[PDB]
Design a binder for this molecule. Structure first.
Ligand code: 940
Ligand code: 940
Lengths: 143, 143
């Protein structure tokens, strides 16, 4: 239900790493292919994300993802807090993968298919779409 | 005033290319550093953008940016239309640059400074922030 809560995880496909962020209340996602599963990539990603949406806290299924100096710096600067599992489910990474499989032949590069999958997932009404729900959640929260 | 209209342009700083997209009604921006000023980069960018926001039409100050087969394909797939200048102002690229200059020492890489600049610009209340205005514009348009 909370407006600023996001979940961030890496998956793998085709020998490559996909970083997936989910806005938990809405199910809206942002994902991209990253060259390697490093702190640098995660830090840059978080900075982009924070600039675009209100990101108040981030949860993850791999806490170690967040130990890098580099990630800590991005969360410090953007003012993001961790939500520890120390501290309800998802399997979006399966759903995303499903859509990625459906569109895969439409593109050469996996990264391209991923963006196609994100678009499709975000716009799928089923009731609003996730894209509609996140703005409605954010707008309501504002006013 | 229209909800789906975006403006897209490349600028240069430090020998590098920054692609800047503006949501015209709100002044909200997304920007990133791209390795080169090519159709491939623009096409991928548009695909990301379309997945995240309702992108109905895109305007540009360099029409030739949109001639590549690659861009045409991304606009075809995402269903984006061009708005020809054939066919009110901006200078965001100056404002962005200004903010980029202010934060530049905070980061090593220009790309990092850019994301910092985007965040700052989007959250600057001055009245809502641009970030607030785009969601309010989008939500209202939905319902
Ligand atoms: C004559 C011709 C011109 C362009 C493409 C092409 C296209 C259309 C796309 C292409 C562009 C936009 C698209 C799609 C493919 N697929 C659907 C969504 O929008 C892509 C995609 O890579 C980028 C450009 C997205 C980085 C790809 O991964 O397939 C790639 C990699 C393409 N190949 S290209 C020209 O070497 O970049 C193919 C041909 C046969
Ligand atoms: C011990 C140490 C550890 C990390 C960094 C560092 C940081 C903190 C940042 C860094 C990370 C997050 C940040 C900032 C810098 N600046 C403010 C916003 O959040 C960056 C930025 O590059 C990436 C990671 C964003 C790709 C950078 O361009 O400066 C870079 C490139 C850094 N350098 S590093 C470790 O080689 O990637 C520096 C030191 C001295």
């Amino acid at each position: 239900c909370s407006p600023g809560i996001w979940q961030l995880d890496c998956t793998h496909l085709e020998g490559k790493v996909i970083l997936v962020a989910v806005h938990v209340a809405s199910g809206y996602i942002e994902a991209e292919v990253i060259p390697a599963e490093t702190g640098q990539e995660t830090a840059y990603f978080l900075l982009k994300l924070a600039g675009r949406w209100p990101v108040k806290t981030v949860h993850t299924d791999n806490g170690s993802n967040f130990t890098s100096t580099t990630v800590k710096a991005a969360c410090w600067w953007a003012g993001i807090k961790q939500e520890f599992g120390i501290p309800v489910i998802e399997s979006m990474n399966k759903e995303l993968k499903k859509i990625i499989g459906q569109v895969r032949d439409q593109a050469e590069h996996l990264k391209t298919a991923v963006q196609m999958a994100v678009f499709i997932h975000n716009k799928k009404r089923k009731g609003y779409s996730a894209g509609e729900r996140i703005v409605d959640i954010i707008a309501t929260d504002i006013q």
